[PDB]
């Protein structure tokens, strides 16, 4: 059950390793627009907070989930900021979120005082008083109920079908380490001059079995004159000397 | 049980020099960054200086930046204010303060001194 | 009233996660200075203070029971701004960085082990953590060093069995790192949690000292452990040992530093004066 | 320099009345502001830290509120030992600046 | 304004941990027991005697010093 568009969820994503390839081969994905990032590089970056918003909308309004748009979704239901760096994902769900005989549980707010700020959520049901006179909680002429239910019959055109939407918004604020991907890897040959990288340590040399003993908290060693001369393989946890 | 006793007040010719001393005994001291605050007679409280817990960074007010220096001796638990080139707008009551900050000094208790009357005549 | 104790050579921790053989390495970082005055709190009747941080904290404790059972770090120790909480159960430590509405006298409450006497609000925490030991691995000294750099913390810890002495014994033991948390929090005030058993407690005692930016000379032996260190601003012979990069100084004059008297004030004399170009005639004409 | 102004700088109210004192800044100080009380002839005693957190040893008549640029000190009732001068303090940018101070008096 | 290097004299760790400091051509009134003023600077931490022995730790200009007495 995705939540309706005027009252959208907001899952804050805490510490993990985030394999985005389970996004990539999951659904037909009517729209998949990554804005600040390019989606082929997501598995090698660190983000601080990944806010995942989630709702449903009609099909001709999926173009309104974008930074700086107009229309009755982006004005006052869900406003993306103009400083956007996330990724908007949207796929059809006419198989699931729409039933025969009207589905009156998806509602959108069509009348309001003015717009929203970015990422602003309202659950008000107070009767908007358009006319000059108060109508004190009784709707009718020049004051209407603000939340109108969607339709979502199955025999509607594509453009009136229930499209589910998840908006990811990555930000990198202050923390030196947070949720990050699971980068490359490669193999581990020995007794060959190779180009190596041991969890950040970039260098060149021949890898050989060592006879040094590191303290469980140490990753690599240096020799006199302050040059790296041994490392510990992050994956296999073995100490290897580096000859040049 | 806290004691902040201050000394060094008296008649000073204009353009003279003083060493205001604040003997602190009670709390632990040298874990708190301490302040010098002054009050002109008949006027509100002003601000003079701030020194950190190790004597590292010192900050002065924008009117007396350069004529005063603030120091601390953690062996005898004292604050010092060297006042040179005093004008007649510095006759005041100087308090040796430990303000309940919580952004810079990180203190939690408010310990004020007693105040010395520095008359520059 | 205060009560001090001389910490002789305490709070020397491993600066980085790098193996080094028999090597005298000269580092410059936040260390607790040698032969310093740490404060010997009791908090036992029940009076535990809210101390500043200013640059890390060296925290030693000698307790065979389980009373000193976590810490509280923060900037106002209230809502509206975030704060860190280290609580220490019988099986696992739970670090939590939320907007805690901290009470006035915070304590745990054991019979059942409750938490509602510490705080009263837990809105919007962005960090959780669970590790097993963190504490208790004749009497046994337990030493910790907390320091918060940039945005992430660092807790160093060492638990050593000692004989009966001044509870800060004459010896040497390096502190090995425990966790490294990416919190992103301004930390300037802290205090310690306790457990009260449901009112009545035993006899607590903890030693608090403050870290300062110092230059040390650490000596790593064959197995990569630190066995000795020299504080390069504790006198003249220690300055000589830090100049030579050794711990043995043979007989003779050894030039170490430079002596250069500073200034003081700053006179600024000029010439008397002369013509004064009268505004008397232009601002004051009849 | 963060200038502060206080209002009203002169005040006279009887017993049981309520007193509001507005502290206005020139920059933005979020919730870092201290409210001191100084009786004439003595060092100032703190009453409210970080603009809302009343201390220990002070009665519950005083209260502090406000944030951003405008802050408010409120005395719900005037006992005769409330007659003093009240001061502000900010904490974000060094130097810390006190207010000019308001004088409470009896009618 | 006076200035100059600072050197530390150690009888050699192996023997003791005492030390004396000579401030080169610094007057003993402008440095900040046994204080001795010599034409080579200010000598602190050693007492100056009128006897004579063989050079031990050369201090300069005719003077020496060594753990003794
Ligand atoms: C953790 O502590 C930090 C330092 O102690 C705080 O950093 C402060 O952030 C302010 C912005 O939120 C800075 O204000 C800016 O200051 C510069 C010059 O100092 C001005 O040009 C800017 O105009 C001003 N910003 C605005 C909006 O006017 C402070 O200068 C800065 N402090 C320092 C010492 O640099 C963090 O805010 C604090 N974090 C929390 C969560 O409290
Ligand atoms: C990282 O994961 C790998 C998974 O391959 C671990 O390697 C296995 O470790 C177990 C435990 O000793 C062995 O029984 C297996 O034989 C290992 N796999 C292979 C292919 O050799 C590795 O131990 C993990 N490292 C850490 C530090 O957890
Ligand atoms: C402006 O002009 C008037 C008149 O010339 C000055 O007033 C004289 O002031 C001096 C000293 O203050 C007195 O000795 C005279 O008797 C005053 N004269 C009169 C006619 O009042 C006034 O001082 C001038 N302003 C300045 C700044 O010099
Ligand atoms: C510790 O305190 C005592 C008494 O307060 C003092 O004499 C001593 O010098 C202090 N130690 C240091 C290193 O300052
Ligand atoms: C401590 O907390 C963990 C999880 O937070 C819990 O499993 C454990 O039972 C707690 N300890 C006690 C003694 O209840
Ligand atoms: C956490 O949620 C609270 C809601 O009470 C909000 O005020 C606060 O700004 C949030 N924290 C952050 C870091 O956004
Ligand atoms: C530690 O060093 C000693 C020699 O000083 C050696 O005998 C011992 O085996 C070493 N320990 C380990 C675990 O290698
Ligand atoms: C100095 O002591 C060392 C042991 O620390 C020893 O090897 C050496 O022989 C000693 N020197 C003299 C002159 O006795
Ligand atoms: C040091 O200064 C004093 C006067 O203060 C003088 O008597 C003495 O001769 C000076 N010493 C040297 C070595 O010049
Ligand atoms: C050394 O002898 C001189 C005279 O040659 C005398 O003035 C001086 O006081 C003597 N020094 C001592 C330490 O007795």
Author numbering:
A (entry chain C): 346 to 589
B (entry chain H): 1 to 121
C (entry chain A): 25 to 68, 78 to 144, 153 to 178, 186 to 246, 258 to 345
D (entry chain L): 1 to 107
E (entry chain A): 590 to 621, 640 to 676
From the paper:
The S protein is a trimer containing multiple domains, of which the domain that directly binds to the receptor angiotensin-converting enzyme 2 (ACE2) is called the receptor-binding domain (RBD).
In this work, we solved the cryo-EM structure of the S2L20/BA. S protein complex at 3.1 Å. Each subunit binds to one S2L20 antibody with a highly conserved epitope near the glycan flank at position N234 of NTD, close to the RBD side of the same monomer; and the interface is stabilized by numerous polar interactions, which are consistent with the previously reported structure of the S2L20/S protein of Delta variant. In this work, we obtained several antibodies with relatively conserved epitopes, mainly from E-RBD, H-RBD, and C-NTD classes.
